[PDB]
Amino acid sequence: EVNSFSGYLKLTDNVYIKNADIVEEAKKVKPTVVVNAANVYLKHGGGVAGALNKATNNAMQVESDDYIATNGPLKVGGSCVLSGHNLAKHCLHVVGPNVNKGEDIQLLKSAYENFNQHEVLLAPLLSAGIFGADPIHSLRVCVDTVRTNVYLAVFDKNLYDKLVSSFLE
Ligand SMILES: CC(C)[C@H](Nc1ncnc2[nH]c(S(C)(=O)=O)cc12)c1ccc2c(c1)S(=O)(=O)CCC2
């Protein structure tokens, strides 16, 4: 079956959320698009990007190095479409701002705007974790910006519960 997301809670008409590991969701669902929380040189060294690369047995990193050699780095707030390998038809590599490294939080709107070129996506919460954005603010920007159908996988029950409570205020 196509895009068989299960156990998500619908927040708005086009935003759904689950307490789940995006790598395990991608292997089960085989979505048309999985979003990677990338950096501008597509170096998948840890966190979500490192885990998605490891699940492709490093094929995503080799493909990413070839893209950067020909095209140069991405900009913060930008994206590129590459192969999904065994995880999806396509991977949309999106660069959210890293607030812990001084990047502008306003670019989080530009980052989520890349999702609107794809009808259905499996995604992480952009700029959260060690990128330093406030995760409740990242969910609000996602809900206000994305107009296509996005399934957010957030792999922490404590954070998932705080995000659903904040949305339902
Ligand atoms: C907030 C946090 C619970 C979330 N983590 C995750 N969310 C969803 N699926 C996950 N799998 C794994 S794993 C066990 O394969 O490493 C982690 C994970 C997350 C969301 C966004 C970002 C990060 C982390 S980061 O990697 O710190 C920096 C880039 C932006």
UniProtKB/Swiss-Prot annotation:
It catalyses: Thiol-dependent hydrolysis of ester, thioester, amide, peptide and isopeptide bonds formed by the C-terminal Gly of ubiquitin (a 76-residue protein attached to proteins as an intracellular targeting signal). The gene is rep. This is Papain-like protease nsp3. Changing residue 165 to L: In strain: Gamma/P.1. May form homohexamers. Interacts with N protein. Changing residue 32 to A: In strain: Mu/B.1.621. The chain holds residues 1024 to 1192 of 7096 of the full protein. Residues 2-169 form the Macro domain. Coiled coil: none annotated. It is a multi-pass membrane protein. It comes from the Viruses.
